UniProtKB/Swiss-Prot annotation:
RRM1 and RRM2 domains preferentially target UGU(U/G)-rich mRNA elements. This is CUGBP Elav-like family member 1. GO terms for biological process: embryo development ending in birth or egg hatching; germ cell development; mRNA destabilization; mRNA processing; mRNA splice site recognition; negative regulation of cell population proliferation; negative regulation of gene expression; positive regulation of gene expression. The keyword ATP-binding does not apply. GO terms for molecular function: BRE binding; mRNA 3'-UTR binding; mRNA binding; mRNA regulatory element binding translation repressor activity; pre-mRNA binding; RNA binding. The modification Phosphoserine is found at S167. The chain holds residues 14 to 187 of 486 of the full protein. The keyword ATP-binding does not apply. Component of an EIF2 complex at least composed of CELF1/CUGBP1, CALR, CALR3, EIF2S1, EIF2S2, HSP90B1 and HSPA5. Associates with polysomes. Interacts with HNRNPH1; the interaction in RNA-dependent. Interacts with PARN. It comes from Homo sapiens (Human).
Length: 175
RNA sequence: UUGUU
């Protein structure tokens, strides 16, 4: 597939980029290798992990299948751990998720889904409830794209007041 | 009791 950066743990601290390139190139072409370093004192030191960026997702997956939880590098007591790097995380859920406040306590998950369905696909909708299943009068709504969440906010924030509520509905990005 | 899982 397209390029992807993988985080790799249980790499011996003595290994450099050269050693890592050699290992990974067995499975697919490597764009870049970067050993994570600690510069807190002299000299800089490997943190025992690296990033490897493969040109294709296919290569990354083949390396993962071959290595993750399978290959134990020299001196290690656990096998390589490999997964996509944090920097590759794209649609953080946290940035696509709305807090909906001041909704009626009678409001159902389905009620909220319907109210907000016109703005995009809703991947999740949860009413916050207390111990006795009573609504806390608020919800979380996750859209598939933040774009759809912004659209809902502009259209729905304080647009109406629901049954039993002291103020208009609150629609905003979740904390 | 405006309540952010």
């Amino acid at each position: 597939s397209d390029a992807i950066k993988m985080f790799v743990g249980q790499v011996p601290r003595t290994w450099s980029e050269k050693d890592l390139r050699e290992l990974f190139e067995q499975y697919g072409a490597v764009y870049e290798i970067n050993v994570l370093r600690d510069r807190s004192q002299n000299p800089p030191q490997s943190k025992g992990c690296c990033f490897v960026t493969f040109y294709t997702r296919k290569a990354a997956l083949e390396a993962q299948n071959a290595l993750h939880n399978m290959k134990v590098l020299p001196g290690m007591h656990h096998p390589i751990q490999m997964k996509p790097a944090d920097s590759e995380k794209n649609n953080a859920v946290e940035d696509r998720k709305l807090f909906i406040g001041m909704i009626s306590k009678k409001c159902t998950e389905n009620d909220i889904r319907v109210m907000f369905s016109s703005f995009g696909q809703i991947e999740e909708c949860r009413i916050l409830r207390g111990p006795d299943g009573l609504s806390r009068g608020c919800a979380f709504v996750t859209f598939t794209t933040r774009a759809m969440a912004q659209t809902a906010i502009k259209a729905m924030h304080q647009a109406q007041t629901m049954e039993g509520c002291s103020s208009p509905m609150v629609v905003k990005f979740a904390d």
